[PDB]
Design a protein around this ligand. Structure first.
Ligand SMILES: [Mg+2]
Length: 1048
């Protein structure tokens, strides 16, 4: 019931990146070896970058960082002895290290048992924090280890003493494992630094992606300047020291890279850009503070949120920036023209007071709900303009912060509650003040460093809307597996994961980006466009008998115009001269995807091709994109001379009068908005649209118009004429196939019936596909036969209807969605009837009946109802829809023939269904066949055709497996064993086995091509095959009995 939305802040202004592969200690001798001038410059540069001079007594673990020292490039008795004592031997002017430490053949490991030997828990933490700052990692065991082929880890004398004092053992093991004593020199403690802080564009993109997949809905961004970036060369070290301010600064070139990438890879992610001038107060009124707030990418989208502080920001720790009123007014004016909603960064009480009075009206006008960010536990100053005196303006007063910090150190549960109460009591007046002056507002909380232990409890107490985490606020993360309980955070995603699991523990859920965009009124344009169509068709029934395509097209007129403008922009971009080989397709497809237009691979796309009979179709993707480009440029008058390079391929050119008209292209676009892929097939977006009340009806109507327009285009082509009525084919043991015409004996002789999918209609290509699917299913079950005379029956749909209308893909898709929108089991197609009456109807009669020339038709025996043989059916794609339409017709005849409701249940218990990639909803509360349902998350076509939430993967266990398999090589080995069956019982006894967490890898270990029946069967787990094995090798038995046994 209670939910938070998580903001991730991966960069920030203050913390700095520290390279794990840089030396962390410089002996005195190495510096003293320099000339006085260069030595002074080097040392002061080091000390400005965190390096601290340190006496002898520290220990080091180094390997691989030596370099020869030629004194000609720059001895002394004080130097010469130090070098020799530190293991250097001279050879004229050249020094080199002959002393060498143990290699890293076997990773350095400080065991959990070794650390736990130490008495002081505070000492353990500082050790764990120091090593993890240096790039050491924590094992699952709870130990510390080093993975790289070089190492240079140092600990100060202070560490060594306390280690020796606490336990003069523990220090033992380091010495026994290659660590050794050092002299005086300089040391990099890495204070306010981390090896995981992203300061480059690519690093920031990656950190954002990690945060989002862990559950973050909003990403707070900063960028860092590199104008003062330099490297120090140290004598005797083969790796230079990186120096620079890494100053908080708005870098336009970085955002020019970051934003389009995120828009492509993370389309729904709410992007929040910092306008902060922290680190450069003299630029407080600079237009640079809004220069990054513009439209990015081909989609021309702006950031959704930008930082806004109605008052001065003055940190007690130093730094800060001013926010003059005219400047802020220019900001708000600019935000409005670009579509940016401000987020009020509430640093101090003056901000609050300015917000609820003078800025109250301008902020409401800036868009509702008003967004607030509570920067709590960060010491702030107010400065008197007259005297210059400072006072505490912090949300939590400094005495209270210092108090709270002490209770956190106590570590006891009682000190925690007192800490929470202190924090909440101080923040409550501010929270209440904001709610009282802003009827529509969202308030989030952030806490710096140690106080993050209060983050969840305080946020709950104040009933806040959002919680923020990230490296910007804290560099550590709590981990109970680690001695001390705390370690360096391996990124913001690490902390988001911690926060998410913490909320899960308390039964508190989180809000994803898509849902939040609705709550804040920030829905994406394509989502808005689809809902605009949903609204325009809201009063039309999903029944094809009650509405015409012309009427549907007429209602979508303003939306077609909206799409036309998008297509114009894609056309212009394509007409901007490129490439010569068949890589034009790669160019076109990338351009199309970026503009939101998804070029789909239709099986029946060859219907538009003149010379289809002489086409190979294995290279049918390349000309799809080519003709698509031609299809867009020709009507507008653009040259297609670059294209028609399909001549250099093996016509594939599509005739001009086979070009799709504008409204048809619009319809194709609209039905492609739900369940989109991101740019590189890493994820599925726009999953929310499925949950709309009018979703299925809208899709049914869209495909209705799409069917009409496509058929008209097919009637003017030399596409293969289709045949009336279904085909029946038996496969026994490569399988041999026969073609029954009027035999009920085939049904009795066969183990498995294979229902038709969408493309398997009665015509040359359709039969070929129908055969291939049948062969795949028979090779699948036959393989199961040889593990711990196989006969199959395959059904092909009718290619023509009663009125002579051709059956195409859109016809089946409409039927699919129309079935979804049917509340009572009353809807069924003509194609379903032909299959039903010849396959299912005889199971309800007493004897052979009369069948017409169209193969359509013209009692009970309750004792023999249990005697009916178990009908085992395979289903794929739209197969589950066709199946449920058979159940509907059975009820219609069964009720007409007369049977108890329980009798019909017994009738349906004599049948079984296994569906791979269910592209239609399973009506759980209907009378019908029990189903085992296996549908993949990346099966976008099945997803778009369904409304069940079980198919959607959210951050968790299944999401973990998915991301592991995204980086894993050898995709052919992949099986979805991790899949979890969910079990449901309907009102009328229908049983559904829903597998969750299922997904299918492609050849590039991505998520494309997730509808192939091959991958569904290929990646099938061993435990699943056992179920089918039990199904196959079963006596005269019931479904409910057989399936219920599988629940143990
Ligand atoms: Mg910030």
């Amino acid at each position: 019931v209670k939910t938070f939305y998580i903001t991730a802040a991966p960069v920030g202004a203050v913390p700095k990146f520290l390279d794990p592969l840089e030396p962390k200690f410089i002996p005195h001798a190495l510096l003293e070896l320099l000339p006085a001038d260069r030595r002074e410059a080097t040392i002061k540069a080091l000390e400005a970058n965190g390096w601290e001079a340190v006496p002898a007594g520290g220990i080091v673990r180094e390997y691989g960082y030596d370099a020869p020292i030629d004194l000609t490039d720059y001895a002394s008795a004080t130097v010469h002895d130090a070098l020799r004592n530190n293991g250097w031997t001279p050879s004229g002017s050249v020094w080199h290290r002959t002393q060498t430490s143990p290699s890293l053949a076997q990773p350095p490991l400080i065991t959990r048992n070794t650390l736990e030997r130490l008495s002081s828990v505070d000492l353990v933490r500082q050790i764990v924090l120091q090593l993890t700052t240096f790039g050491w990692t924590a094992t699952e065991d709870g130990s510390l280890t080093w993975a790289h082929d070089r190492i240079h880890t140092y600990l100060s004398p202070d560490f060594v003493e306390r280690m020796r004092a606490d336990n003069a053992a523990v220090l033992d093991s380091l010495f026994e494992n290659g660590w050794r004593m050092c002299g005086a020199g300089h040391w990099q403690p890495g204070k306010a630094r981390s090896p995981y802080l992203p300061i480059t564009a690519n690093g920031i993109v990656d950190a954002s992606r990690e945060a989002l997949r862990e559950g973050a809905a909003v990403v707070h961004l900063h960028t860092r300047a590199t104008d003062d970036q330099a490297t120090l060369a140290i004598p005797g070290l083969n790796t230079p020291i990186g120096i620079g301010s890494q100053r908080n600064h708005i870098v336009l070139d970085d955002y020019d890279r970051i934003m389009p990438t995120l828009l492509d890879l993370e389309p729904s992610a709410i992007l929040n850009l910092s306008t902060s001038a922290r680190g450069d107060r003299r630029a407080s009124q600079s237009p640079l503070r809004r220069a990054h707030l513009k439209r990015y990418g081909h989609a021309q989208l702006a950031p959704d949120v930008a930082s806004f502080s109605p008052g001065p920001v003055v940190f007690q720790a130093g730094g800060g920036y001013d926010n003059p009123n005219a400047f802020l007014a220019d900001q708000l004016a600019h935000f409005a023209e670009v579509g940016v909603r401000p987020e009020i960064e509430v640093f101090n009480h003056t901000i609050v007071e300015n917000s609820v009075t003078l800025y109250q009206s301008p902020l409401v006008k800036a868009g509702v709900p008003v967004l607030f960010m509570l920067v709590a536990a960060v010491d702030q100053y107010h400065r008197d303009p007259v005297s210059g005196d400072t006072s505490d303006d912090s949300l939590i007063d400094v005495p209270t912060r210092k108090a709270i910090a002490k209770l956190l150190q106590a570590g006891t549960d009682d000190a925690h509650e007192k800490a929470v109460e202190l924090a909440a009591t101080q923040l409550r007046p501010t929270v209440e003040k904001l709610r009282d002056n802003f009827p529509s507002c969202k308030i989030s909380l952030l806490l710096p460093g140690p106080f993050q232990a209060l983050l969840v409890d305080v946020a709950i107490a104040l009933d806040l809307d959002g919680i923020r985490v990230g490296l910007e606020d804290a560099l550590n993360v709590f981990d109970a597996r680690v001695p001390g309980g705390v370690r360096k955070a391996c990124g913001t995603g690490d902390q988001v994961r911690w926060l998410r699991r913490e909320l899960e523990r308390r039964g508190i859920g989180i809000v994803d980006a898509e849902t939040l965009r609705d709550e804040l009124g920030m829905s994406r344009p394509d989502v808005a466009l689809f809902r605009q169509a949903e609204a325009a068709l809201a009063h039309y029934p999903a029944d094809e008998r009650l509405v015409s395509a012309d009427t549907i097209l007429d209602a979508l007129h303003p939306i077609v115009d909206t799409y036309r403008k998008i297509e114009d922009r894609l056309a212009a971009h394509l007409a901007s001269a490129p490439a010569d080989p068949a890589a034009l397709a790669e160019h076109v497809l990338t351009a199309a995807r970026s503009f939101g237009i998804t070029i789909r691979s239709f099986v029946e796309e060859l219907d538009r091709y003149e010379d289809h009979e002489y086409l190979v179709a294995r290279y049918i993707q390349i000309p799809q994109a080519l003709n698509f480009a031609r299809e867009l440029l020709v009507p507008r008058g653009y040259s297609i001379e670059a294209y028609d390079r399909a001549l250099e391929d093996y016509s594939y050119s599509v005739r001009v009068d086979q070009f799709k008209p504008l409204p048809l292209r619009c319809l194709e676009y609209l039905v492609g908005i739900p369940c989109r892929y991101n740019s590189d097939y890493s994820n599925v977006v726009n999953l929310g649209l499925r949950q709309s009340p009018r979703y299925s009806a809208t899709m049914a109507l869209l495909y209705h118009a799409l069917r009409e327009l496509t058929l008209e285009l097919r009637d003017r082509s030399n596409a293969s004429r289709k045949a009336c009525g279904p085909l029946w084919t038996v496969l026994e043991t490569v399988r041999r196939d026969v073609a029954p015409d009027e035999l009920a004996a085939a049904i009795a002789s066969v183990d498995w019936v294979v229902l038709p999918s969408t493309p398997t209609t009665n015509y040359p290509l359709g039969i070929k596909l129908s055969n291939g699917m049948a062969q795949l299913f028979h090779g699948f079950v036959a393989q199961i036969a040889a593990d711990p005379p196989l006969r199959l029956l395959a059904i092909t749909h009718s290619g023509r209807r009663d009125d002579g209308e051709t059956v195409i893909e859109a016809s089946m898709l409409h039927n699919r969605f129309a079935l979804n929108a049917d509340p009572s089991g009353i809807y069924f197609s003509e194609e379903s009837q032909l299959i039903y009456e010849r396959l299912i109807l005889p199971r309800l009669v007493d004897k052979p009946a009369k069948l017409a020339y169209t193969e359509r038709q013209l009692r009970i025996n309750a004792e023999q109802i249990e005697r009916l043989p178990l009908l085992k059916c395979f289903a794929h794609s739209s197969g589950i829809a066709t199946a449920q339409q058979l159940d509907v017709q059975a009820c219609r005849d069964g009720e007409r023939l007369g049977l108890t409701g329980d009798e019909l249940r017994a009738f349906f218990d004599r049948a079984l269904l296994v569906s791979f990639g269910s592209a239609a909803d399973i009506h759980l509360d209907w009378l019908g066949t029990s189903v085992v349902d296996v549908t993949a998350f990346n099966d976008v076509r099945s997803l778009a055709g369904t409304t069940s939430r079980h198919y959607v993967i959210q951050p968790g266990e299944h999401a973990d497996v998915l991301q592991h398999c995204l980086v894993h090589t050898q995709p052919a080995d992949y099986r979805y064993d991790h899949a979890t069956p969910v079990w449901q019982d309907g009102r009328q006894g229908k049983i559904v086995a829903r597998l969750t967490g299922v997904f299918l890898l492609d050849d590039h270990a991505r998520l494309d091509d997730g509808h192939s029946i091959r991958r569904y069967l290929a990646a099938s787990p061993l435990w699943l095959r056992q179920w089918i094995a039990r199904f196959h090798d079963a006596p005269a038995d019931t479904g409910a009995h057989a399936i219920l046994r599988e629940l143990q």
